[PDB]
């Protein structure tokens, strides 16, 4: 919803209640890298004329976008580093910044693991420089969270993909939200009466 | 015969009177802010309010 309501972009320009417009550029671009899919991510920045200049003004913010489309995994640590230092000082991001850290991780891992059906972590050391056990426990905790299922062979240094998630995850959202919803109405049902 | 009534003139549109009223009618139509309301009003001398 944030990026959707941010679609007006430059049409609001500089405003007192909108504070700094240069910083509005950065706030509106920080949300577009999550909920916006890659075709649509470049659809907004490349096709949108009003937003193309403001990104050209700041070379640091532009670096993250074009490096994200470039798929280079060496810069993502350095670029998200700056993004994380700005995330700390700026307000309202204190609660939410730690989720963002892993968000961009899985968003890079998506495009990563979708290219090859069989992959080795030793190859990932070249792009990450150099992850060995780092990405081991990392990816393990991404898998345990049901985020981008992929089967990794331990001590054999093999990663497998799959995952045809359109089966279980299609039907899993129903149970995940259904349980919480009905457990809410259970309380409201026992409230009345007494 | 000058008796009796209140005299109030109806003025023609003026430049400075064109600026604010321009914004007023422009409140309902989506547009960006790169529009210069100063130069656009001087191009329209006379004409009318409507």
From Swiss-Prot, chain A:
Superkingdom field: Eukaryota
A single BP term in Gene Ontology: proteasome-mediated ubiquitin-dependent protein catabolic process
Span of domain PCI: 1-166
Gene Ontology cellular component annotations, sorted alphabetically: cytosol; extracellular region; ficolin-1-rich granule lumen; nucleoplasm; proteasome accessory complex; proteasome complex; proteasome regulatory particle; secretory granule lumen
Keywords, ordered alphabetically: Proteasome
Biological role stated in the UniProt entry: Component of the 26S proteasome, a multiprotein complex involved in the ATP-dependent degradation of ubiquitinated proteins. This complex plays a key role in the maintenance of protein homeostasis by removing misfolded or damaged proteins, which could impair cellular functions, and by removing proteins whose functions are no longer required. Therefore, the proteasome participates in numerous cellular processes, including cell cycle progression, apoptosis, or DNA damage repair.
Family: Belongs to the proteasome subunit S10 family.
Subunit structure: Component of the 19S proteasome regulatory particle complex. The 26S proteasome consists of a 20S core particle (CP) and two 19S regulatory subunits (RP). The regulatory particle is made of a lid composed of 9 subunits including PSMD6, a base containing 6 ATPases and few additional components.
Protein name per UniProt: 26S proteasome non-ATPase regulatory subunit 6
Source species of the chain: Homo sapiens (Human)
Encoding gene (name): PSMD6
Coverage span on the entire protein: 196 to 389 of 389
From Swiss-Prot, chain B:
Cellular location(s): Cytoplasm; Nucleus
Oligomeric form and interacting partners: Component of the 19S proteasome regulatory particle complex. The 26S proteasome consists of a 20S core particle (CP) and two 19S regulatory subunits (RP). The regulatory particle is made of a lid composed of 9 subunits, a base containing 6 ATPases including PSMC5 and few additional components. Component of a complex with USP49 and RUVBL1. Interacts with PRPF19. Interacts with TRIM5. Interacts with NDC80. Interacts with PAAF1. Interacts, in vitro, with the thyroid hormone receptor (in a thyroid hormone T3-dependent manner) and with retinoid X receptor (RXR). Interacts with ERCC6.
Annotated family: Belongs to the AAA ATPase family.
Function recorded in the entry: Component of the 26S proteasome, a multiprotein complex involved in the ATP-dependent degradation of ubiquitinated proteins. This complex plays a key role in the maintenance of protein homeostasis by removing misfolded or damaged proteins, which could impair cellular functions, and by removing proteins whose functions are no longer required. Therefore, the proteasome participates in numerous cellular processes, including cell cycle progression, apoptosis, or DNA damage repair.
Protein name (Swiss-Prot/TrEMBL): 26S proteasome regulatory subunit 8
Source species: Homo sapiens (Human)
